Structure formats: structure tokens, C-alpha cells
Amino acid sequence: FPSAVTIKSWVDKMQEDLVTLAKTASGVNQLVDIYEKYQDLYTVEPNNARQLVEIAARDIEKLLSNRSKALVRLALEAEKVQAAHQWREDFASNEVVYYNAKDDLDPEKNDSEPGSQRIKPVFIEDANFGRQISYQHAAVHIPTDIYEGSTIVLNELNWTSALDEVFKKNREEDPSLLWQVFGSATGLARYYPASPWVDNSRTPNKIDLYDVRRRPWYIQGAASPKDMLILVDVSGSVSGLTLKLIRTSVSEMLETLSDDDFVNVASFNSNAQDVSCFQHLVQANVRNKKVLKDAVNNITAKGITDYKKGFSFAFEQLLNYNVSRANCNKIIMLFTDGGEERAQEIFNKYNKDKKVRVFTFSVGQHNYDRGPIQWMACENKGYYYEIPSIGAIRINTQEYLDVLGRPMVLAGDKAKQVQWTNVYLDALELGLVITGTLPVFNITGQFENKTNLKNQLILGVMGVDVSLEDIKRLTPRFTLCPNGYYFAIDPNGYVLLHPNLQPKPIGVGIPTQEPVTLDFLDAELENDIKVEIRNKMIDGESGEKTFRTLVKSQDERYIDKGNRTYTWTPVNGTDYSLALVLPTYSFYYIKAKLEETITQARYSETLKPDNFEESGYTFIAPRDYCNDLKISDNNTEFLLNFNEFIDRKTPNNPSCNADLINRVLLDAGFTNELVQNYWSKQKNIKGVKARFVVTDGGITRVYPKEAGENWQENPETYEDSFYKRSLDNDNYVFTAPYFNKSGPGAYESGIMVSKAVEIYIQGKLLKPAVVGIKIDVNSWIENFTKTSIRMDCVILDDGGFLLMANHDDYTNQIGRFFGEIDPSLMRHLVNISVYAFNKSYDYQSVCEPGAASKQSCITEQTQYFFDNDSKSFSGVLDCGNCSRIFHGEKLMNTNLIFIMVESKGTCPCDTRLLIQAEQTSDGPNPCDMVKQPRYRKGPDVCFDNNVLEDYTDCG
Ligand SMILES: *[C@@H]1O[C@H](CO)[C@@H](O[C@@H]2O[C@H](CO)[C@@H](O)[C@H](O[C@@H]3O[C@H](CO)[C@@H](O)[C@H](O)[C@@H]3O)[C@H]2NC(C)=O)[C@H](O)[C@H]1NC(C)=O
Ligand SMILES: *[C@@H]1O[C@H](CO)[C@@H](O[C@@H]2O[C@H](CO)[C@@H](O[C@@H]3O[C@H](CO)[C@@H](O)[C@H](O)[C@@H]3O)[C@H](O)[C@H]2NC(C)=O)[C@H](O)[C@H]1NC(C)=O
Ligand SMILES: *[C@@H]1O[C@H](CO)[C@@H](O[C@@H]2O[C@H](CO)[C@@H](O[C@@H]3O[C@H](CO)[C@@H](O)[C@H](O)[C@@H]3O)[C@H](O)[C@H]2NC(C)=O)[C@H](O)[C@H]1NC(C)=O
Ligand SMILES: *[C@@H]1O[C@H](CO)[C@@H](O)[C@H](O)[C@H]1NC(C)=O
Ligand SMILES: *[C@@H]1O[C@H](CO)[C@@H](O)[C@H](O)[C@H]1NC(C)=O
Ligand SMILES: *[C@@H]1O[C@H](CO)[C@@H](O)[C@H](O)[C@H]1NC(C)=O
Ligand SMILES: *[C@@H]1O[C@H](CO)[C@@H](O)[C@H](O)[C@H]1NC(C)=O
Ligand SMILES: *[C@@H]1O[C@H](CO)[C@@H](O)[C@H](O)[C@H]1NC(C)=O
Ligand SMILES: *[C@@H]1O[C@H](CO)[C@@H](O)[C@H](O)[C@H]1NC(C)=O
Ligand SMILES: *[C@@H]1O[C@H](CO)[C@@H](O)[C@H](O)[C@H]1NC(C)=O
Ligand SMILES: *[C@@H]1O[C@H](CO)[C@@H](O)[C@H](O)[C@H]1NC(C)=O
Ligand SMILES: [Ca+2]
């Protein structure tokens, strides 16, 4: 065992060698002084985060107010044109002409109902929607389980033509509108841009179960937030088919509860108990709904019924005010079959002011008495539903929600307020959208008062979709550092907008149409400062906060010790709150002063893929430079069209943004001046395998043009993990290649090395680019084993990944996590606390399904980093019945640590492994997360318990 000073100087000499090689070949200084050499070619401008947040909040509120105005127009016209409708029973004499969405494109003259003539439209391909779109009329969706020629459906299809016309008007005053739709309460759905239904028109194994009245936006706009409590009657008499139907019905009832709704499930048989681990009303989000569904699926029937001990439990759990709730619409859902017990005194004791509804469901095919079941609904403002078989399950849930909207109708114009739903995946696939709803009231008898029989029910709900990518375009991101970004938030803390929000459903457990509800604390790493910021944003305040944050790298494999500054404002007129993350060095950006029309041309000439031998292999970020350019995943295609458009650019002045092209051309020119005046004068270094420079404008020219085929970084520089990592870290960062990845690999590509330029203009810190070297593995291993005369030696970077070693069998598994190699040293070296680790959760990850294609689960990813700042570490590894010695030295001015451990093939301490990998897991235990739930602000105004409501419709 060499002494500490010997291997200390050893590490010092390797770090001197590596730093000198990287600094020379990379040419940080040459790119720097090129950047300061042309201060007359640009201007440095500030990123006033306060004004940026205010501007983006104003823009988003303007967009949402535009959609609100569209909704108001549509709802007013719907009410007016249904008020003046004449009921009919004969449509043979007067056909209704409409386009049915699930019509085959074949010119079939025989696909018409008696009372309806079908339109055959001319479908154009549209860029906004990505489907066939006809602007000449609205399309109609009628569920399969609903006949499309009955009297109700035919009358609705008759009076919705004015809706069609107002659809046209709305789209004519605002060409950016997406799907705008009337969700009828008869089952129909009439959206304006006529497009064929998704895949379910006529396709085997593609059945169309879509029903507009179950959709989250319809569920949301049809009533006010609930406080359910599903009483399931698991007694003896419900065994067999009845219990199957009850558990399916409870699942389908839970599938109609939003995140503003609170629900628990109880079950009684001579004794009432909770079916799950929850002891009170919990929020009805995806995780809690799954827990309740599992508990209901795991339920068995036994014992004698007792309707008094069950309703006592229900009324007691609805009297709990210690927990978070939505103090509104208290309900009891009784899932029984029948009995001769009315329990008058329980109701008279607990529900005497009749503050709580009771919806009773007589599930099953049986001959038990159904009188008390129908009476509990009458004396408690409820309604009585029957579920004789699966297939009747879907319709009755929509129907209690039909009942709950009576108090909302009676409040004439105080109940017509626009509400936006959680981020969900559109049916007519558009990606991620939020829908703004407004309910439509039946106003036939009004100011000419008639019997007004069913004037307490809504006609439907009008929705208009806002694309999430449409919100993303109101928050311009390219004037910020690749580490700076915007994000918005719900009142529940979910993110309207965030870089880590992907168009995938939220995972809920282990694999074996829910909304994309991703909390703010789960889209990032969670400190306590971030909990304070989240609570401040939910309340709708404004403020600033500068602090130190662990910023996880994009590749989800490292953690860096960042330096952030959150500024937030509420978006006026809505429930959303916008914030802007901004690094401390990102307060200034370079504004390209390209107005010569010739300098930009001599910059542009560098970009055709015919000069890729004096200038490096060029990739361009597929940004929206001009709208006539379509971004392409195949990058060289986009480069070709970019060159083509640059060839004739001058007349396209208003067609596109000048700033992006000016900056990208300026950066291309600077990169060319670097690659010729410093890289083309040398042409060859033994150690290097590739020299690259990546710039925020989009230029990522890699020099040799040979490793450019081995280059696997994203063309858009703002999504380059190493580029974002190297800006926060003001030092050299080595990115260990991927292990066991099918492709160019590591030997014939090298290992990535990078440092970020740190130029100063007017005494301001701004970092416009990164340079780097793809050091070859052999040219390092020879130099590492060259000095061995002056075996177990390993090099580790941040995250504990083996960059390279000496045993020559570890170098076979290069880049692989060191804990997978010898986990005992990994655990011990963590125990010294040189490597801290953070374990977090990824709710939006694809997942291989096991046993009890790929589903989505919650994966539990961990990342390691330098816990302490100390440089020298020594100790003894107390292996089981043996002893091992190590010394650790962190190379100065890099992210590396050298471990001098001398022990191979000793007694087996390889009991387990430290597998730093995206491990499949269950999420946090929900039974423990509902007792300290995250802060959350419920909706303010809700409508229940009106005195004009006519309860004599128990059905
Ligand atoms: C292992 O291989 C060679 C060993 O010679 C390393 O390169 C040498 O690194 C030392 C570090 O201190 C330099 O002095 C050697 O010469 C230098 O060359 C540069 C070239 O620009 C000059 O500017 C310097 O002034 C100095 O003369 C250098 N020699 C060569 C031929 O590169 C090599 O970096 C190392 N392998 C790895 C992967 O780092
Ligand atoms: C909105 O409310 C109005 C009234 O509040 C509804 O119109 C009424 O609908 C009923 C059907 O439920 C009509 O009764 C029917 O009349 C025909 C012909 O007279 C008869 O053959 C049927 O057996 C049935 O009795 C009623 O005439 C009609 N109008 C009025 C003034 O009551 C309307 O249906 C509601 N909106 C929707 C979308 O349902
Ligand atoms: C994620 O990684 C961070 C790395 O900073 C972890 O934060 C650190 O956690 C340790 C363990 O709790 C904290 O040490 C504790 O400090 C308190 C206060 O001095 C002391 O009383 C305890 O005995 C313990 O030593 C450490 O302070 C904390 N770092 C900071 C900056 O606060 C974090 O725990 C990891 N996990 C998660 C889920 O964040
Ligand atoms: C929102 O309204 C408040 C007070 O009405 C105002 O101070 C703030 O500047 C407004 N924000 C925006 C973005 O208009
Ligand atoms: C809102 O609509 C007006 C005209 O109807 C339009 O000028 C404006 O650009 C729209 N706002 C947004 C954010 O698109
Ligand atoms: C209802 O049907 C009649 C007869 O076909 C038609 O004249 C009327 O315009 C229809 N209503 C609407 C709102 O189009
Ligand atoms: C839940 O399922 C397990 C496994 O089938 C079973 O042992 C347990 O009894 C079930 N829970 C209840 C409350 O019956
Ligand atoms: C709520 O808290 C009070 C006092 O902390 C306690 O007496 C009561 O038992 C708790 N539970 C309910 C359901 O009120
Ligand atoms: C940002 O970094 C500097 C030095 O790199 C440090 O002094 C400062 O405290 C950091 N910011 C915060 C908010 O701690
Ligand atoms: C990309 O586009 C270019 C230009 O048409 C073509 O030569 C190349 O084969 C394409 N590559 C891929 C992978 O599509
Ligand atoms: C280190 O290991 C010891 C025993 O092996 C354990 O008690 C301790 O919790 C571990 N972690 C730290 C930080 O000491
Ligand atoms: Ca019974």
C-alpha cells in the first residue's frame, strides 16, 4: 500500500495531464476571446424575470379569456335556440341532415337512417390537428349503445344546427381554436371541425366505448365538487352475480370523480367498516382511486345486513371536519340489492335538515323488496337507480350526476362560470389539452312561466380545447439558459406546464382515460423551500426566492448543486399561477445584431453539407426559425431546408422571427472561426478522438466528421444533458458513456469531456456555449497504466460511474455503475459520506409488465453525487471475515475521484448489489400520504341545497 502523499502526487499528475489536454484541444480560451473579439456584433440584454413572468401571465390570461368568450357565445346561442324548439315525433317528412363521425368513407347511399340523411364531407389535411378536417360543418358522435334515430336523438340533431353555425363564427374570429364541442345530455357530442372518429368507426377489436357524459370536462361542468361515501352492502344475500355487479359499479362510479372530489368507501354487514386503509374522506386522485378500487375488488360477501349501523357510519364520516375536504355536495351512495328495512330514525337523527343526499342503487337480478330502497332516495333528496346487469352500469353514474345539477340550474347566471380541467389526453388525438367548460341550461319556460317540468336539468356542457403546446408558445424559452424555464400550477399543485411533463398516463403501481395529473413536487426534486414556494403559488401570491437547489440532470443519471431564482405571479382571471426558474448566471443573454445582410450570408454559407471537411459535421436545432420550415427528426433533412430557405430569405420578413435566425447565424460564424483558426491549424492529437462545440443558438459542429456518425446527441442544444450540466458546474464534467447499449458504443466513440465557456462582457457573467473532447479510451488507459511502474485502480466520476480502470476487465464494463462492479466498496464509500444519494419517483415511465405491450408504472430512480467537498479519503473496508484497504483522492478541477483499493478475489462480500437503475416500484404508500396531505386550495363557489328544487322525481 503506497502512502497517501505518493498516490496524491500520482493523482495530481494525472489531473494535470487531463486538464492540460482538455483545455488545449477544447480551446476554451480561443472561443472565449473570439466571443469578446466581436462585442460590436451583438448586444447583451437582461432577463428581468419579473417582467417576463408578468408578460407571460398576461398572454395566458388573454388566451383563456378568448376561449371563455367563445364559450359564452356558444352557450348563449344554445340556450336561445333550444328555447325556441318545437317537439316532434315525425322526421320522415322533414329529414335531419348531419354528418355522423363514425361513417365509413365509402360512398354508400344505403347507410342512412329513416329520419336522417347523412352528409358526406370533403376532408382536407390540417397541420394544427393532424387529421382530416372539414370546416364546412360539425360532426356528431353517437355512442353505440344509443340508437341514432330515436325521438330524443333526432330532436337534438335538429336543434343543434345553430350550434354548428356559431362554431363556424367562433373559428372565423379566432383561427387558433381547437375542438369546440357541445356535449349533450342525451349522449350526443357535436364538435366543430368535422373529423372522423379516432379508430372506432367500424373496426374489429376497436370498439367505441366513448361517452361524452363520462368525460372529465363534462363531469366537471355538470355539477359542483362532491363528498361521496359509497356504502357497499356486502352481506350474505349479495353473493354471486350481485357482488360482481356491485364491485364493477363501484369501480365505474369512482371513475367519475375528479381531483376536486373527496370519497371514501364503506361496507356494512351487521357492522360497518372501511373497505380500505383510509379512515376518512380522501381526495379522489389516481392513486387514492386505485387504492379504493383494489379494496372493492378484494371484497367478499358474508353476514346479515344492518342498514342502521351502516348509515350511522356514513353520516359520521360525512361529519368529520378535521380532514381536508370540499365542503359541498355531501352524498351517500348505497349499493345494496333490497330489503325490508327503512331506518327512518337514523335519517331523522343524522339527516333532519336534509343536508345529505342519498342515492340508492338496487344492483342485481333478484326478487327482493325494493320499497325502502326507493323511499330512502325520496326522503333524502336522492334518486333510485337499478343495475340489473353489466351494460346498465355505465348509464346510471352519469345519471346521479344529472341529479346533482339541479341546484346549479336554479342559480341562473351565477352558475355560468368558465372552468378549466386537469391536463388530459385528447380523444381525437391532439396530445395534451385542457378543456374549458360551461353548462347549458334548459330555458323553455322562462318569464312566460309554465309547468317547467324538467327545467331543472342542464341541456349539456360546452367545451373548447386549448392545446398544451399552444400554451407553451406563449412562454418563449430560447432567451433563457437551457436551465431556465417556466412552469404553471393548479390550486391542487398539479402542473399545467413543466419540462418534465410528458404526454403519457400517470403510473399508479406495478403493471400486471385518466388525466395527466402530475404534482409540482413530483416533476422536480423536493426540498422544503420548494414546498414553501408551492404553497405560496397555490395561494395566488407573488414573490421572488433565490436559493440553492439539487438540479437533476436531464439524463436522469446525475445530480448537480444548482443555483436558482424562482419568481412567480398569479395568472389573473384563472386559478393558475405562473413561475419562472432562472439561474443566477442566466440574467443576461446575447442579442444578435445581424443587420448587414451580407455578414449573415457569409455565416450561412458554412452550413451546406458539402463543406463538412474544413468545418465540422454540422447539426442544427430543429427550432421554429420560420413557419414554412417543418421540423424533422431526420436532422440533415432540416439542415437542407434551412439552407434552402436561407438562400431566399429577404422577402420572408413577417413570415418568421428574425431573432432566432440572427442568433443561430452569429453562433455559426463564431463556431466556424473557432474550427478554422484553432482546430484546422492542428488537425490531429493522439489522445483526442473528437472535438465538438455546442452553442445555445443551435450550432453543434463536431470536427472530424468521422465521430459525427458516432455522435448521438440531440440536435436541439437545450435538450443536451451534458450542456445543461456543464453550465451549472463551472468546471470540467466527464459524462460516462452508456453500458451495454446497442450502437456505436464507447471504444470506437470515446468518452465525453466538456467545459462551458464563461466569457465576460461589460463585467457580466454569461455562458453562451460549451466546448468538449471525446477522449479515446485506449489513449487514456495506456497513460494510466504507463506510470504504474513509477492490480486494482479505478476512476469514478459523479454518480459513482467507472470512467476507466487498470485491471482491463473493468474497462470491458466501461461507463457501468461502480456499485454493480464491487458493491461492498460502494456501500462503504457511501458510508464515509463522500457520495450522497437522492431517491425519487418517475410517474410517467414505460414499464415491463410482470406476473401475479408495456404498461406504465412508477419507477424509482436514484442518483449519486459528491456529498462533501473534501479531497482525500482513506480507510479500511471491513469485509466479512477479512479486511480491505482503500484511499480516495478527488482530482482537482474536475468531477473525478480516484480510488486506490488493493483487493481482488477476496472472501465474498458480494451479498447484494447497489443497482443505480430506473427500478420498477410502487409509489409512496398512499395510506400514509393522506394523513399529511399536500396543501391544496379547493374551489370557492359551489351550488347545493336549493329550496326551489323539486325532489318529487325519485325515479
Ligand atoms: C497520455 O498520453 C500523453 C503522454 O505523452 C498525454 O499527452 C501529453 O500530456 C502532457 C500533460 O502535461 C503534455 O505535457 C504533453 O505535451 C503537451 O502537448 C501539448 C499539445 O498542444 C502542448 O501544448 C503542451 O505544451 C505540451 O507540450 C502531451 N503530449 C502529447 C503528445 O499529447 C495524453 O494527454 C495522455 N492521455 C490522455 C487521455 O490524457
Ligand atoms: C327542456 O324542457 C322542455 C320543457 O321543460 C322540454 O320540452 C318538453 O319535452 C317533453 C318530453 O319530455 C314534451 O312532452 C311530450 O310531448 C309530445 C307531444 O306533445 C308527446 O307526444 C310526448 O308523449 C310527451 O308528452 C313536451 O311537449 C316538451 N315541451 C314542453 C313545453 O313541455 C325539453 O325536452 C327539454 N330539453 C330537452 C333537451 O329534453
Ligand atoms: C437528497 O439529498 C440531500 C443532499 O443535501 C439530502 O439533504 C440532506 O439530508 C441530510 C440527512 O437528513 C441532512 O443532514 C441532517 O441535518 C440536520 C440539520 O443539521 C441534522 O440535525 C441531522 O442529524 C442530519 O445530519 C442534510 O442537512 C440535508 N442537506 C441539506 C442541505 O439540508 C436529502 O436528505 C436527500 N433526500 C431527499 C428526499 O431530499
Ligand atoms: C393581476 O392583478 C393584480 C391586481 O388586480 C395586479 O397587481 C397584477 O399586476 C395583475 N397581473 C397581470 C399579469 O396583469
Ligand atoms: C384573442 O382574440 C383576439 C381577436 O379575437 C386576437 O387578436 C388575439 O390575438 C387573441 N389572443 C391570443 C392570445 O391569441
Ligand atoms: C328543426 O326542424 C325543422 C324541420 O326540419 C327545421 O325547419 C328547423 O330549422 C330545425 N331547427 C333548427 C334549429 O335547425
Ligand atoms: C385482500 O386479499 C388478500 C389476498 O387475497 C386476502 O387474504 C385478504 O383477506 C383480502 N382482504 C380482505 C379484507 O378480505
Ligand atoms: C376531530 O378532532 C377533535 C379534536 O381534535 C376530536 O375530538 C374528534 O374526535 C376528531 N374526529 C372527528 C371525527 O371529529
Ligand atoms: C450561487 O453560487 C455562489 C458561488 O458560486 C454562492 O456564493 C451563492 O450563495 C449561490 N447562490 C445562493 C442563492 O446560495
Ligand atoms: C434524411 O434526409 C436526407 C435528405 O433527404 C436523406 O439523404 C437521408 O437518407 C435521410 N435519413 C433518414 C434516416 O431518413
Ligand atoms: C454507516 O454504517 C453504519 C454501520 O455499518 C450504520 O450504523 C450507519 O447508519 C451508516 N451510515 C452512516 C451515515 O454512518
Ligand atoms: Ca341482505
Give me the DSSP letters along 280-333. S-EE-SHHHHHHHHHHHHT----S---HHHHHHHHHHHTT--SS----S-BEEE
- Cα separation, 389 vs 246, whole angstroms: 10
Q: How far is the CA of 173 from the centre of ligand 5 (A)?
A: 9
Q: Are 460 and 174 in contact (CB under 8 A)?
A: no
Can you tell me which atom of ligand 2 is nearest the CA of 452? 5
Number of H helices, E strands in the chain: 25, 43
- Cα separation, 258 vs 261, whole angstroms: 6
Give me the amino acid identity at 5: V
Q: Are 518 and 487 in contact (CB under 8 A)?
A: no
Ligand nearest to the CA of 634: 10
Pocket probe for ligand 5: among 58, 60, 62, the residue whose CB has the most ligand atoms within 8 Å is 62
CA-CA-CA-CA torsion sign (548, 549, 555, 558): positive
Q: How far is the CA of 115 from the centre of ligand 6 (A)?
A: 13
- Cα separation, 814 vs 316, whole angstroms: 62
Q: Are 737 and 655 in contact (CB under 8 A)?
A: no
Please, which residues have CB within 8 angstroms of residue 668's CB and are 6 or more apart in sequence? 603, 604, 606, 607, 618, 697, 699
Length of the chain: 955
Q: How far is the CA of 336 from the centre of ligand 12 (A)?
A: 8
Pocket probe for ligand 11: among 825, 827, 831, the residue whose CB has the most ligand atoms within 8 Å is 831
Give me the amino acid identity at 543: G
Pocket probe for ligand 7: among 277, 298, 299, 927, the residue whose CB has the most ligand atoms within 8 Å is 298
- Cα separation, 738 vs 692, whole angstroms: 19
- Cα separation, 421 vs 219, whole angstroms: 10
| Main-chain phi, psi angles of 718, to 5 degrees | -70, -15
Strands 419-420 and 432-441: antiparallel
- Any alpha helices (H) in 438-484, and if so which ranges? 468-472
Q: DSSP of 59-121, one letter per residue? A: HHHHHHHHHHHHHHHHHHHHHHHHHT----S--SSS-EEEEETT--SS--TT---TTEEE---
Straight-line distance from the first to the last Cα atom of the chain, in angstroms, rounded to the nearest whole number: 88
- Cα separation, 949 vs 456, whole angstroms: 8
- Cα separation, 195 vs 779, whole angstroms: 60
Q: DSSP of 1-34, one letter per residue? A: ---HHHHHHHHHHHHHHHHHHHHHHHTHHHHHHH
Pocket probe for ligand 4: among 572, 576, 577, 578, the residue whose CB has the most ligand atoms within 8 Å is 572
- Cα separation, 802 vs 813, whole angstroms: 8
- Cα separation, 490 vs 497, whole angstroms: 10
Please, which residues have CB within 8 angstroms of residue 328's CB and are 6 or more apart in sequence? 224, 225, 226, 227, 942, 944
650: exposed, middle or buried (Cβ count in 10 Å: 0-12, 13-18, 19+): exposed
- The neighbouring-strand residues paired with 134 are 194
Q: How far is the CA of 174 from the centre of ligand 5 (A)?
A: 7
Element (H, E) at 864: strand 862-866
Q: How far is the CA of 242 from the centre of ligand 12 (A)?
A: 11
Eight-class DSSP state of 194: B
Q: Dihedral, CA atoms, 911, 917, 921, 927, nearest 10 degrees?
A: 90
| Main-chain phi, psi angles of 489, to 5 degrees | -150, 150
Largest CA distance in the chain: 105
Instruction: Tell me the three cell numbers of residue 236.
Output: 350474505
- The neighbouring-strand residues paired with 206 are 203
Pocket probe for ligand 10: among 637, 639, 641, 642, the residue whose CB has the most ligand atoms within 8 Å is 637
| Long-range Cβ contacts of 943-946 (<8 Å, 24+ apart) | 943/224, 943/407, 943/408, 943/411, 943/414, 943/415, 944/224, 944/328, 944/329, 944/404, 944/407, 945/354, 945/355, 945/407, 946/406, 946/407, 946/410, 946/411
Please, which residues have CB within 8 angstroms of residue 562's CB and are 6 or more apart in sequence? 483, 548, 549, 550, 551, 583, 728
Among protein residues, the one with the nearest Cα to ligand 8's atom 8 is 322
Known binding residues for a divalent metal cation are: 233, 235, 237
Please, which residues have CB within 8 angstroms of residue 801's CB and are 6 or more apart in sequence? 557, 736, 815, 816, 817, 818
Closest CA to 826 of 785, 858, 794, 856: 794
Instruction: Tell me the three cell numbers of residue 683.
Output: 488537425
Eight-class DSSP state of 790: -
Q: DSSP of 888-924, one letter per residue? A: EEEPTTSS-EEE-----S-S---SS----S-EEE--S
- Cα separation, 199 vs 300, whole angstroms: 38
- Cα separation, 44 vs 39, whole angstroms: 9
Please, which residues have CB within 8 angstroms of residue 128's CB and are 6 or more apart in sequence? 176, 178
Judge if the beta carbon of residue 676 lies within 6 A of ligand 8. Answer: no
- Cα separation, 791 vs 348, whole angstroms: 85
Among protein residues, the one with the nearest Cα to ligand 6's atom 11 is 159
Vertex 504: Cα angle to 499 and 505 (nearest 5): 120
Ligand nearest to the CA of 836: 3
What method did the depositors use to determine the structure? Answer: cryo-EM
Closest CA to 693 of 753, 783, 633, 624: 753
Among protein residues, the one with the nearest Cα to ligand 2's atom 27 is 87
Give me the amino acid identity at 55: I
* Cα 287 to the center of its chain, rounded Å: 16
Judge if the beta carbon of residue 572 lies within 6 A of ligand 4. Answer: yes
- Cα separation, 514 vs 508, whole angstroms: 11
- Cα separation, 823 vs 820, whole angstroms: 6
Instruction: Tell me the three cell numbers of residue 873.
Output: 479519503
Q: Residues with Cβ within 6 A of ligand 2? A: 87, 89, 442, 444-445, 452-455, 459
- Cα separation, 261 vs 333, whole angstroms: 14
Ligand nearest to the CA of 689: 1
DSSP E strand stretches across 789-834: 794-796, 802-805
Strands 42-46 and 588-592: antiparallel
- Cα separation, 136 vs 134, whole angstroms: 6
Vertex 112: Cα angle to 108 and 118 (nearest 5): 85
Among protein residues, the one with the nearest Cα to ligand 1's atom 11 is 17
Please, which residues have CB within 8 angstroms of residue 453's CB and are 6 or more apart in sequence? none
Q: Are 954 and 384 in contact (CB under 8 A)?
A: yes
- Any alpha helices (H) in 504-656, and if so which ranges? 520-523, 529-538, 599-604, 635-647
SS3 content of the chain, % helix, strand, coil (to 5): 30, 20, 50
Judge if the beta carbon of residue 838 lies within 6 A of ligand 9. Answer: no
Q: Are 691 and 679 in contact (CB under 8 A)?
A: yes
Give me the amino acid identity at 357: R
Q: Dihedral, CA atoms, 597, 603, 607, 613, nearest 10 degrees?
A: 150
- Cα separation, 319 vs 251, whole angstroms: 24
Buried b (16+ CB within 10 A) or exposed e, 442-476: bbbeeeeeeeeeebbbbbbbbbbbbbbebbeebbb
- Cα separation, 307 vs 15, whole angstroms: 78
Please, which residues have CB within 8 angstroms of residue 925's CB and are 6 or more apart in sequence? none
Please, which residues have CB within 8 angstroms of residue 914's CB and are 6 or more apart in sequence? 817, 819, 820, 823, 826, 827, 830
C-alpha to C-alpha distances, 493 to 124, 259, 325, 500, 533, nearest whole angstrom: 40, 11, 16, 15, 11
Q: How far is the CA of 338 from the centre of ligand 4 (A)?
A: 57
- Cα separation, 221 vs 213, whole angstroms: 10
CA-CA-CA-CA torsion sign (480, 484, 488, 491): negative
Closest CA to 39 of 702, 578, 760: 760
- Cα separation, 360 vs 476, whole angstroms: 53
Q: Are 766 and 583 in contact (CB under 8 A)?
A: no
Radius of gyration, CA atoms only, the chain:
33
**Residue with grid cell 358526406, as numbered in its chain:** 120
Among protein residues, the one with the nearest Cα to ligand 1's atom 24 is 20
Give me the amino acid identity at 39: Q
Ligand nearest to the CA of 530: 3
Q: How far is the CA of 543 from the centre of ligand 9 (A)?
A: 19
Closest CA to 303 of 333, 274, 271: 271
Can you tell me which atom of ligand 11 is nearest the CA of 833? 13
Please, which residues have CB within 8 angstroms of residue 86's CB and are 6 or more apart in sequence? none
**Residue with grid cell 455559426, as numbered in its chain:** 668
Judge if the beta carbon of residue 320 lies within 6 A of ligand 8. Answer: yes
Closest CA to 632 of 614, 615, 644: 644
Q: Residues with Cβ within 6 A of ligand 5? A: 59, 62-63, 66, 173-174, 176
Ligand nearest to the CA of 830: 11
SS3 call for 612? coil
Instruction: Tell me the three cell numbers of residue 351.
Output: 339527516
- The neighbouring-strand residues paired with 263 are 282
Vertex 926: Cα angle to 925 and 930 (nearest 5): 130
Instruction: Tell me the three cell numbers of residue 36.
Output: 469578446
